[PDB]
Amino acid sequence: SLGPQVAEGENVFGVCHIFASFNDTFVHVTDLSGKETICRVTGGMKVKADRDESSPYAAMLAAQDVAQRCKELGITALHIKLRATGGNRTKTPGPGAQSALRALARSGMKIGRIEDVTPIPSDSTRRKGGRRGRRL
């Protein structure tokens, strides 16, 4: 918890993978390589209602919790790596990333380079469902 780094002159970088879908949000922060984690909280950690766990407020609360964890641990700067569901399902990010980014910026956590890293397919396998789709 104690380290010989310079606070005023420079800063410490990590990366944070924000995976947001239409069912859940994932605010995961690691080191610069991504091999070694820092803290991982999700939209199920803050709200116990299973209706809206991909809600913006749950993602906001999880982002404030992981920002407090990185502040008490000693991480000052973050590189945002945004992610959707990917694959053959969808490409639009979920309704938690917009609140999660603003909650990460509002807490005093400095933001470096932001990027969308989602799995894009070059015509992968068949999507779940019939030929006529899911009729509702």
Partner 1 sequence: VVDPFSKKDWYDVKAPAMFNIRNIGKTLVTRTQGTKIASDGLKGRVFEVSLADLQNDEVAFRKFKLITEDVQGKNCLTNFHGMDLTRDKMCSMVKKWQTMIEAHVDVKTTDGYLLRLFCVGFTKKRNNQIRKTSYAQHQQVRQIRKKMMEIMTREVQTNDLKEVVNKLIPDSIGKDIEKACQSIYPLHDVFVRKVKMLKKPKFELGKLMELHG
Partner 2 sequence: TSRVQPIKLARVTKVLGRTGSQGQCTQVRVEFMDDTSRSIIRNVKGPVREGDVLTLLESEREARRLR
Partner 3 sequence: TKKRRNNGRAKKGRGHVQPIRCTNCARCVPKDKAIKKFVIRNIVEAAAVRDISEASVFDAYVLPKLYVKLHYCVSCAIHSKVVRNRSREARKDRTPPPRFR
Partner RNA sequence: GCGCAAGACGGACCAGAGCGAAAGCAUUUGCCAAGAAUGUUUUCAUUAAUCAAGAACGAAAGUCGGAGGUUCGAAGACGAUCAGAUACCGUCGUAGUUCCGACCAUAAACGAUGCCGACCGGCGAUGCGGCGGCGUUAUUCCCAUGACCCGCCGGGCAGCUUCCGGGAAACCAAAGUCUUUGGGUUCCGGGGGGAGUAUGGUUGCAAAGCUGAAACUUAAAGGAAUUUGGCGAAGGGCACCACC
Partner RNA sequence: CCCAUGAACGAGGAAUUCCCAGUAAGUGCGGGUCAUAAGCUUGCGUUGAUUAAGUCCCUGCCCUUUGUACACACCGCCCGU
Partner RNA sequence: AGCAGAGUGGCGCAGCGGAAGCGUGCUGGGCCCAUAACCCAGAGGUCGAUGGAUCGAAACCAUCCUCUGCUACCA
d(CA 125, CA 95): 26
Taking CA atoms, 58 is separated from 10, 44, 63, 97, in Å, by 32, 8, 9, 11
67 binds partner 2 (CB under 8 A): no
Nearer of residues 3 and 130 to partner 1, judged by Cβ = 3
Q: Is 99 helix (H, G, I), strand (E, B) or coil?
A: helix
* Tokens encoding 20: 């947001």
Identify which of 84, 63, 74 has the alpha carbon closest to the alpha carbon of residue 16.
63
> Whole-angstrom Cα distance, residue 29 to residue 36?
9
The stretch near partner 1 (CB under 8 A) out of 16-24, 48-56, 60-68, 107-115 is: 107-115
The residue length of the chain stands at: 136
Name which of residues 3 to 42 contact partner 3 (CB under 8 A): 11
Stretch that binds partner 2, among 31-39, 71-79, 100-108, 110-118 (CB under 8 A): 100-108
**In this chain, which of 24, 31, 47, 91 binds partner 1, going by CB under 8 A?**
31
3-state class (DSSP) for residue 86? strand
Verify binding: residue 57, partner 2, rule CB under 8 A: yes
Taking residues 102 to 121 in sequence order and writing x for each that binds RNA by CB under 7 A, - otherwise, the string is: ---------------x--x-
Binding site for partner 1 (CB under 8 A): 1, 3, 5, 12-13, 15, 31-36, 73, 112-113, 115-117
